[PDB]
mmCIF file of C-alpha atoms in Angstrom:
data_model
loop_
_atom_site.group_PDB
_atom_site.id
_atom_site.type_symbol
_atom_site.label_atom_id
_atom_site.label_comp_id
_atom_site.label_asym_id
_atom_site.label_seq_id
_atom_site.Cartn_x
_atom_site.Cartn_y
_atom_site.Cartn_z
ATOM 1 C CA UNK H 1 -64.457 37.956 -71.397
ATOM 2 C CA UNK H 2 -66.226 37.523 -68.071
ATOM 3 C CA UNK H 3 -63.721 39.902 -66.547
ATOM 4 C CA UNK H 4 -63.753 42.315 -69.504
ATOM 5 C CA UNK H 5 -67.486 42.538 -69.703
ATOM 6 C CA UNK H 6 -68.184 42.726 -66.006
ATOM 7 C CA UNK H 7 -65.896 45.735 -65.762
ATOM 8 C CA UNK H 8 -67.420 47.246 -68.874
ATOM 9 C CA UNK H 9 -70.813 47.133 -67.199
ATOM 10 C CA UNK H 10 -69.599 48.311 -63.814
ATOM 11 C CA UNK H 11 -68.086 51.419 -65.361
ATOM 12 C CA UNK H 12 -70.990 52.111 -67.698
ATOM 13 C CA UNK H 13 -73.371 52.105 -64.725
#
């Protein structure tokens, strides 16, 4: 998840 979520955030912002 750490990977999944970090990327989620990066892209969102």
